[PDB]
Each structure stands twice: as C-alpha cells, then as structure tokens.
Amino acid sequence: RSGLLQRDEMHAQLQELENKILTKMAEMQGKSAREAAASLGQILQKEGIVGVTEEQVHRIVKQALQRYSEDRIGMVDYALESGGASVISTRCSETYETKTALLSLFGIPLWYHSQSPRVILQPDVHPGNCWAFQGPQGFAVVRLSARIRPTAVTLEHVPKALSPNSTISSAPKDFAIFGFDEDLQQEGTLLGTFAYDQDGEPIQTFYFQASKMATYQVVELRILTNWGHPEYTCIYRFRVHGEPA
Numbered sequence: 001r002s003g004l005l006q007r008d009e010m011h012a013q014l015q016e017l018e019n020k021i022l023t024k025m026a027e028m029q030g031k032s033a034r035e036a037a038a039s040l041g042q043i044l045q046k047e048g049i050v051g052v053t054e055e056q057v058h059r060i061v062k063q064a065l066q067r068y069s070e071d072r073i074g075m076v077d078y079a080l081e082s083g084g085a086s087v088i089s090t091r092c093s094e095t096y097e098t099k100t101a102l103l104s105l106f107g108i109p110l111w112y113h114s115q116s117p118r119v120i121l122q123p124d125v126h127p128g129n130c131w132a133f134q135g136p137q138g139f140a141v142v143r144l145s146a147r148i149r150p151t152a153v154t155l156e157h158v159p160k161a162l163s164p165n166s167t168i169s170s171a172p173k174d175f176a177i178f179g180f181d182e183d184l185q186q187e188g189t190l191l192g193t194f195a196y197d198q199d200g201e202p203i204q205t206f207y208f209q210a211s212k213m214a215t216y217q218v219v220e221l222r223i224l225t226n227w228g229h230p231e232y233t234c235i236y237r238f239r240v241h242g243e244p245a
C-alpha cells in the first residue's frame with residue numbers, strides 16, 4: 001500500500017509464515033542449497049498462491065541458512081516448559097514491552113515483539129522470542145519439571161549478526177543462580193555466579209561446584225548486569241541441568 005512499516009494486517013501472516021518456514025529449514029540444514037529451494041517452493045505451493053521466482057525462493061533459502069546456529073546441548077533441560085516446567089509469574093521482574101525493526105527472510109522489515117517470561121523456557125530463540133525487563137537488573141523464577149540436583153546451567157542469546165544494530169548489548173552479563181528448597185522458602189541458596197560472554201558463542205553452559213548435594217525444584221535466574229544496553233535486558237532461553245533425585 002504505502003510501503004510504510006507498521007503493525008498492519010500484512011504484518012501478521014508475514015510473521016506467521018516466516019518462522020513457519022524457519023522451523024522447516026532445520027530439517028534440511030544437511031541438504032544442498034539447490035535441494036532446499038525446491039522444497040521451500042512446495043511449502044509455498046502448499047499454502048501460498050503465487051508461483052515464486054526461481055531465485056526468489058533461493059534467496060529466502062540463503063537468508064534462512066543463517067538463522068540457524070548449531071545446538072550441541074544434549075543434556076536434559078529440566079526448565080523446559082513442554083517438559084513440565086513453568087515460570088512462577090508473581091516471582092519475576094515486571095515484563096518490559098519493547099520492539100525492534102529487523103529484516104525477515106523475505107527482506108521485508110518487520111516489528112519484532114518482546115514476549116512474556118514464559119518464552120525463556122521455550123526452544124524457539126529467533127530474534128524477538130525473548131523476555132525483556134527494564135534496566136540491567138532483573139530476575140525470573142522457574143519451577144522445574146522435576147526435583148533435581150542442579151549441576152549446570154545454559155544461557156543463550158541471539159547471534160550478533162541477527163541482533164539489533166549487530167551488537168548484543170541487551171544480553172545478560174553477570175548473573176547468579178539461586179536454589180529454593182520448596183515453593184514456600186523465599187530464602188534462596190546461591191548455587192553460582194557467572195558471566196555470559198558477549199564475544200563468545202550464542203549458547204553458553206555454566207556448571208556449579210560438584211560437591212554440594214542440595215536438591216531443588218525451584219530455581220532463580222538473577223541478572224546482575226547486561227552488556228551495556230541502557231534501556232532493557234532480554235533473555236532468549238534459560239536451561240537448567242542436573243541429576244534426578
């Protein structure tokens with residue numbers, strides 16, 4: 001219409017179509033760039049109407065080929081929502097509603113919206129699927145899917161290349177992990193203090209001191225600092241690993 005970027009109706013399906021394509025691409029990360037484009041042309045020919053150009057599909061493929069970053073984490077995630085874990089709503093920082101204009105797979109700029117604390121327990125970590133709170137300090141409390149002996153923690157953020165302004169300044173920096181013996185404790189035990197490295201890999205794993213046998217089902221992620229973003233901090237995914245009791 002105007003060509004203006006705005007929260008229009010065209011914006012709706014275009015976002016819906018985008019990460020619908022993305023969840024399909026991971027299945028063909030081991031396929032040729034030529035083979036991938038042919039398949040993508042058929043999911044388009046499964047719902048979309050127009051027979052897309054031969055290279056236009058190929059370009060979406062080339063673009064989608066770096067919305068993928070390797071996930072080598074094979075450990076059980078006891079903070080995974082679909083596994084039975086949940087974010088304790090009343091025990092989280094106030095959700096900060098923020099948005100960023102970024103380029104989608106189709107080249108069209110889209111407003112990407114920040115979500116509820118729930119998404120930090122969700123595997124989808126595409127740009128925007130993160131929970132933001134105001135300032136460099138915040139916290140989220142998670143009830144794990146099972147009572148475990150915590151042994152490690154995994155924190156990930158979007159890659160720099162897909163991040164707003166190609167910097168990662170909104171990523172958490174120094175953080176602490178707390179364990180709560182029950183849901184009725186509100187006297188946390190400090191499991192460990194770490195720092196998410198902005199210059200490191202998107203996915204980073206941190207392990208605790210391996211001699212304390214304390215058992216937990218409730219865990220707090222407390223962000224102490226971020227990587228310089230003066231307005232907010234957002235978390236893409238928080239994982240909790242350990243041994244089942």
Ligand SMILES: [Mg+2]
Binds near residue numbers: 119122124237
């Ligand atoms: Mg997520």
